[PDB]
Design a protein around this ligand. Structure first.
Ligand SMILES: NC(=O)C[C@H](N)C(=O)O
Ligand SMILES: NC(=O)C[C@H](N)C(=O)O
Ligand SMILES: NC(=O)C[C@H](N)C(=O)O
Ligand SMILES: NC(=O)C[C@H](N)C(=O)O
Ligand SMILES: [Mg+2]
Lengths: 334, 328, 332, 328
């Protein structure tokens, strides 16, 4: 019989992928830096207070700028998380900000582990005055260690805020406060190492999706084309000529397409290419029942998913189905 | 005779649109003529003598260089015949046309763009009061010398910074980096700001005898981005390419490789960002000098395209193009 | 059906020193001492958690130039009482009198588990501060099972030094600590120690010195010898009834005549008198120029004056007979 | 070829000692005279015309101010009658006599001190060759103007930095901070250094009329140090006190308090260190200027005593004493 208890700190695994969080330059003050050149051990050791909140173990997955994120790394991450779920209490992924909102959503759809998975980055390199990385990493570990964080999907933690992987996006090129869930808001705020969660995502995620990438070595090919005045149809045609499985249109306004672009995508859809209309506009849904007769052309409306997120869901949809009506149902549920 | 003379130049948009009913979110664009738009707001007679001309009647998703050239040449030619201009237009590409005119209009009389998120037929249609406030703005002598303006949702916005921020909200138009110039209340404007970037008669861009513009395309960056869009533009001999980069203008490695080649082979390359606010800067991760790339600053990709097209009427030299991107 | 990784439990007993000091900039040389608490020193080296389960206790927070018998007694009693409650001890301390504390504990600690002393020549706030890595290596040493049964140790500048022979050799050099007669026990590289030596003199649980019930130690002072030396210092210790006097002699423990005269008198009155030397290396021997048995004096051997004071104080807890004190100085 | 006239001034020491056995350690100092020592090294006739004078015959543990005065006066008076001096002396306080002479000798001709760790009767006794090498050094014209020297174990050492480092080793004498001046091999010296601190004829210390020196005592610091030694020197009215401090010149609190009070009464107080190498610095843990204390630099406590006594023949102002300790 024990006569007293002791507090046990959770085991948290850090999966490091690079990013400005791991970036460095030669001056504390100059803006120039190189990404992904500092290892995970260095990041942990720069936050000596992590020992107060978790038993941390670091693993270097890759060390890249997130501008070079790709399908291979996504599959690696999802499989590692799903395989290693039973071995830890939670995960933190250090990652670049530039495509964090894509990876987070991919993982939000493909992770099956029911322990928290928290992504984190930094807007200033590790070497800069007032670098944001250390406290962001601390708060990410706080979030991954909180029992309340489970069953909320894959999270992003930046600037004292817990954000869901589906709605989160980077809103500013340089500001440390850039990450916002611009349609539906954050889940919780962090103060003094404690989170007050007031929201959770209603769209199905993680173990409630059908997307199972455990055996996959590649993902369906999906490209993104931009719309604007006098838009060339040559980007769309190039993707069609290469046999792309899907194309997402970054439309103008509520997902509208320049006529040339429309014409190429209509034609492609008729031959079986999947075509999703999203929007270059930074907030709001690309809706059904506006100026485009989606049913007639075999197009899908992306809802609040921006083009790059729409790409993520469409690649996954394409592992299950090629039928536009079933792909629309997916875009209505995940 | 005591009121200003204001010319409406109509191009279409949902402001000139039409629904099957008041609630139905389904609607046709650019179908009402300018005369019907003016006549639907009889209170315009309280504030201006309004004359309307139809330029085109299209959805702004189909806006093109030919319409832009038409508009600038018309405004420049007719400047002396009127006191102010209001341009009715679609929302979708208003931010592009506004900036093109901001750079090519030489009249320093007010030029004010306006649109609507809802057609006239819808409940609580936004177009009537928007049109009224646009005419108020074009009639205000304080609106002069501020560049080309967009007036939406009781706000006056400069054509360089203004952009649409939401796919359906009547309050979509915002100057997301530097803020609005003034707010409109009870038919009056309190202007507290003006753009510092050179505009209108302070730019060298002269489109009076141009019938076409240099070819400039936009490629998007994302994880695992294909280089095929960029290669298709290079293969067609595009004069320039704007990159909608990730974060602070960054490029996916395959796209970076193609654009790096393009910049040495006769294509001007501008790095902009898919991120909705903030500058694409120099002196971050990309050595622009080494590659011959230009950084867009606060110009988003579609606006960077506008400025690159016009730069390429003057020069192909990346240093000179960067200096243009630092002044306008 | 399952194994669990475990790290040694190490207790850090803090006493102050420049290791716990501070200055007003990274470059200036004027340091405060004994200002930072143990928790703050430990927190500053997060890598400690990967080699040990560390707990810290503040004993005092002083400059070691003010170290005294009361702190010595506290340290020995604490280590002896808590031996069964940890796997090893590190003591943070000033450099100035480290060599004295180390030898006192070497004689009075009865735990055979590692006891490792550590300090710094610079505070944490100075450029290239030595304390963080010094602390790290001290914990590496205390956690190494090979460090047991070697007596009390001092770990400085990647070197493990025995508490009997270790001394500070330079006023400012980070490499000051050396075992100047017999050498170090081992060197530390990449968190591992290659021990090649151990002290042969009896230490720790092989000594008879038991301070567990003592509130105070016998009074022992030190007098310096030099040309024309005054006998007044020696006279002042005699007049106060000191239990012992150590001579910091010239050369091989020799005394200026007037100091000699005072101490020869004192020895016959029952004051214990130890000849040591101001010379920094080598033994103060018998059978040179002084007939120790005639005068009733003890020769210190390789013990320098301040170390000889430590042993004499302890000897005086057992005995006042010069022959017996000499045998103590031949064994410990 | 003419041999230099060298004078040997003998003071005693183990070099002049003897015991009953070649192979036991017991000996007494001064069993032999200077004539005996000279005649035991007939090889000296190869290199110098040697004359011996016995000044005293003591163990250097009993060296005192009166012998120092006698030595300096003798050297300064007899400088013109000879080409160089060798002083045979005990090891124990050689480093004090050498520095006293380094500051008070005005003769620029060589003055070389020498002793032995083993008595003359010992197997492998070091004194014969030591004496030979000291006469070599005194006979070398290159030895002039280097200050008073100590020659032991084939090494020429300056009087300021030289100290005995080991209780028994024949190689004990070292210049522990700044190194030797030269090494001797086959009767020849390669000098590569000379002391920069002012010595001999470049000091103001003139002892020619003095028959006593200011009273200066030395107190030791250690854990739980008694203030009683310090208080005794204060109560006797000592002119100066040197502290053998711990580490970089630090003092035990009760010793510090005694000396702080003494300094305000006018006693000169120098902080030195028991630590065998390195300077006792200013700008560490003690505010010397506040207390009226002087930092000794590289001077050990016994050497600091030498310079303090001499300073006190000129001044008792602590600022001026510090300037002396910075120059000599
Ligand atoms: N702030 C950042 O992390 C930007 C970096 N280019 C990345 O996404 O890896
Ligand atoms: N509200 C609008 O005006 C949208 C329409 N597609 C346009 O831009 O012409
Ligand atoms: N470096 C040091 O620790 C010197 C300090 N005076 C001490 O012994 O406490
Ligand atoms: N070796 C020596 O000369 C030691 C002797 N006690 C002396 O200094 O006179
Ligand atoms: Mg317990």
């Amino acid at each position: 019989m024990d006569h007293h208890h002791h507090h046990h700190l959770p085991n948290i695994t850090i999966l490091a992928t690079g990013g400005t969080i791991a970036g460095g330059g030669d001056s504390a003050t100059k803006s120039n830096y190189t990404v992904g050149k500092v290892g995970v051990e260095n990041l942990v050791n720069a936050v000596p207070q992590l020992k107060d909140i978790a038993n941390v173990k670091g693993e270097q997955v890759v060390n890249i700028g997130s501008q070079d994120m790709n399908d291979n790394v996504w599959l690696t991450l999802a499989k590692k998380i799903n395989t290693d779920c039973d071995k830890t209490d939670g995960f933190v992924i250090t990652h670049g900000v530039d495509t964090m909102e894509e990876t987070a959503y991919f993982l939000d759809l493909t992770v099956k582990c029911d322990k928290p998975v928290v992504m984190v980055g930094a807007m200033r390199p590790s070497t800069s005055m007032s670098a944001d990385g250390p406290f962001n990493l601390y708060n990410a570990v706080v979030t991954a260690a909180d029992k309340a964080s489970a069953n909320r999907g894959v999270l992003v933690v930046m600037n004292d805020t817990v954000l869901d992987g589906r709605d989160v996006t980077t809103t500013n090129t340089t500001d440390v406060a850039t990450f916002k869930s611009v349609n539906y808001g954050p889940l919780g705020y962090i103060h003094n190492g404690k989170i007050d969660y007031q929201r959770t995502p209603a769209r199905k995620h993680t173990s409630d999706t059908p997307f199972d990438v455990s055996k996959l070595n590649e993902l369906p090919k999906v490209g993104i084309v931009y719309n604007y005045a006098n838009a060339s149809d040559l980007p769309a045609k190039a993707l069609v000529d290469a046999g792309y499985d899907g194309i997402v249109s970054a439309g103008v306004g509520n997902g509208n397409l320049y006529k040339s672009v429309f014409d190429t995508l209509a034609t492609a859809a008729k031959t079986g290419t999947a075509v999703v209309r999203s929007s270059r506009v930074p907030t709001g849904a690309t809706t059904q029942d506006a100026e485009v007769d989606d049913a007639k052309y075999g197009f899908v409306a992306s809802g609040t998913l921006n083009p790059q997120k729409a790409r993520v869901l469409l690649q996954l949809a394409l592992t299950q189905t090629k039928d536009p009506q079933q792909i629309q149902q997916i875009f209505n549920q995940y």
